Design an enzyme around this catalytic site. Structure first.
Site, PDB file in Angstrom:
ATOM      1  N   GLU A   1       1.366  21.847  51.689  1.00 53.90           N
ATOM      2  CA  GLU A   1       1.036  20.844  52.694  1.00 53.90           C
ATOM      3  C   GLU A   1      -0.463  20.671  52.792  1.00 53.90           C
ATOM      4  OE1 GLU A   1       3.058  18.897  53.759  1.00 53.90           O
ATOM      5  OE2 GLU A   1       4.904  20.007  53.303  1.00 53.90           O
TER       6      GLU A   1
ATOM      7  N   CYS B   1       7.717  23.428  61.300  1.00 58.32           N
ATOM      8  CA  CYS B   1       6.877  23.746  60.164  1.00 58.32           C
ATOM      9  C   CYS B   1       5.450  23.218  60.274  1.00 58.32           C
ATOM     10  CB  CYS B   1       7.473  23.253  58.857  1.00 58.32           C
ATOM     11  SG  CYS B   1       8.856  24.214  58.363  1.00 58.32           S
TER      12      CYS B   1
ATOM     13  N   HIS C   1       6.167  24.524  51.453  1.00 54.50           N
ATOM     14  CA  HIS C   1       7.578  24.183  51.632  1.00 54.50           C
ATOM     15  C   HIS C   1       8.375  24.528  50.383  1.00 54.50           C
ATOM     16  CE1 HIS C   1       6.967  21.414  55.256  1.00 54.50           C
ATOM     17  NE2 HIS C   1       8.087  22.044  55.560  1.00 54.50           N
TER      18      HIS C   1
END
EC number: 3.4.19.3
Lengths: 208, 207, 208, 207
Positions: free
Chosen positions: D78, D141, D166
């Site tokens: 991310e 998350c 992820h």
């Protein structure tokens, strides 16, 4: 020869997980006296048909498991039907294309695969492998060899020989080779793919 | 006495194939052709009985079966109807089938007999994206394609062009998607109906 | 000028539905004295930034609706956040690429869009238009102009001017131009796209 | 006293991020680095409280937060944690949030401070496909990514590399998909755990 043979095919390669699975499983001994005989088919329908006919005639298999890569599919799948048409979205390896071409004049529009589809799905699930039945194999070389094999078997009085097609996802190599502008592919490690082909082969021979 | 194109859609909550068939009923096409529209129920036995009656009573010169394929982005033409019933979701009677042959001692499949490439070209000329699909599913949509092609062949009418046209969700179908599921490709109903009309006109122009 | 202006931008083109929507809606009179002023931005970030800064300065808009094509998305979307990074998956129209490049040294990592997002979604739904909020605009020129506009407005004491980005699907022309080997695109007729931009513009000015 | 990489996953029915974190706990890496693993609850307030304690008590030299992104085909990193909470599905307390800022008078976002390109290259060298993701969602998350980056900055520890990884569904997640929903991309858990390990090793090699 004198013992029951499962004929296992994959397609010759950049990278092809069906070739790798077929190569690793060649000679595998299965319960009930069954042995796997593996061969690689070229990705051109005329040469693939001629090569598969020779294998069907010379190996006289008790079951036929044809496999190929379906880049983009997330899970192993079993093809329900081989359609008697060739229609290529991409050229084969001879640079050739076909459009709406019947595979054989005055032959059935399709043959249903004769593998024990539900038994394979159940064996996959017991082995913790997600999978499903697919109702179109495409109209490329993969579908062609499914139709070719089912037709040959029926025309030689061997319609009872279980015969079908197993599409496999991309492996890591296929996924890594995707260009940066194209979408990322679902993939499986090759060991997962080979194990799924093995589990399917074991389910086929246990039923037959 | 005039040539009839039989145009079917499926009865609904919202179904764009029903809306297209309802709007196009009675459309006059060149060469004396007229569209006769009917809605089929989403239950295969009743749908087969209803379609057999339409084929018998209307004696159509061409058959355009249509249905919703929620999730497909563009109109598609089905290449092949498979003689198997296998339902991922129940029909409208709450019934499912599992690997069930449609008819004993019948072909494993029938190829659609519509002029597929002619329709794709007519769509492209009308600025409509579209393509041939090589599986219709094994739900009621596929069932009626196989049913119609089989009936026509068994009544000496195999030359009657007959096929299936799947349409995307319209706005209503897409708006009804629950918040937990992914958004659907869709087309305004006027785009969907126009695609069905263009296909109908291409079919009758060839015959 | 003396009347409230909604600044509506699209991107210059093969085919771009955001350009067509902006061109059709230029000069649209909205309730409350509001008028739409449309302009097309080039698909190169430096020239697009310079052009957008001039529009923000010269047009002094009461609201800013930036639009662009998101080929592959099925429905109109509103961008929640402009991220202060340039990272190009494809070159711009000058053949240039950027990788992990901060848009501005010592500026915020992101700006949230200040359009009335939920009001627009509700106006779309009332108009029977499916749509949603997107939480990444990409890091291409579209995201760049969202971040650029939000930063410029805040740095000129105009943070209260509602400003955001609206991505639109492919139109028919974009979908028809997809090569045969690539997957088919979701699309909308241009009239559906333009109407969605219009409904969003009307919702923005009714709130502001 | 030795450098610690803090590795988190989320508590479950099946969660591959939990399995990867559990297997890698205590892993020794070159340069004196050790992995300390912990599982976070899937409720943002409790997850934030638990992560703050880990950051405070473990004083890690790097932070690798992981979670399941069911549907993604490949591992992803991310790029940015957004200061908004917006839940498409409830958390484990049955709670949802709507366009809620995580913290008043805090940045709209924090960029992850992991060596992203170094990790992608380490993955590629290990024959693992992967990429950078530019939205973590706005579920728990994303919340812990923003929470961790904010906490580190507010405690003068902004230089501590910190980010989110992820992972796809594993076999168990894919097998649990109902028959009416589309099949999920997945990876065997051993592939997922190896990707987390390779990322961890790349992180500590840079610092």
């Amino acid at each position: 020869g004198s013992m029951p043979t499962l004929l296992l095919t994959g397609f010759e390669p950049p990278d092809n997980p069906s070739a790798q699975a077929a190569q690793e499983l060649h000679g595998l001994e299965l319960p009930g006296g069954w042995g796997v005989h593996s061969a690689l088919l070229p990705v051109e329908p005329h040469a693939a048909g001629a090569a598969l006919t020779r294998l069907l005639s010379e190996q006289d298999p008790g079951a036929v498991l044809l496999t190929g890569l379906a880049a983009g599919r997330p899970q192993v799948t079993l093809e329900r039907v081989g359609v008697g048409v060739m229609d290529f979205q991409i050229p084969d390896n001879a640079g050739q294309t076909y459009r709406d071409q019947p595979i054989e004049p005055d032959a059935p529009a399709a043959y249903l695969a004769t593998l024990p589809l539900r038994a394979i799905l159940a064996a996959w699930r017991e082995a913790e492998i997600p999978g499903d039945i697919s109702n179109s194999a495409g109209l490329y070389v993969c579908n062609f060899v499914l139709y070719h094999a089912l037709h040959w078997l029926r025309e030689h009085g061997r319609g009872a020989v279980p015969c079908g097609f197993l599409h496999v996802p991309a492996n890591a190599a296929v996924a890594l080779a995707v260009p940066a502008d194209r979408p990322p592919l679902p993939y499986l490690p090759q060991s997962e793919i080979t194990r799924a082909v093995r589990v399917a082969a074991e389910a086929i021979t246990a039923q037959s």
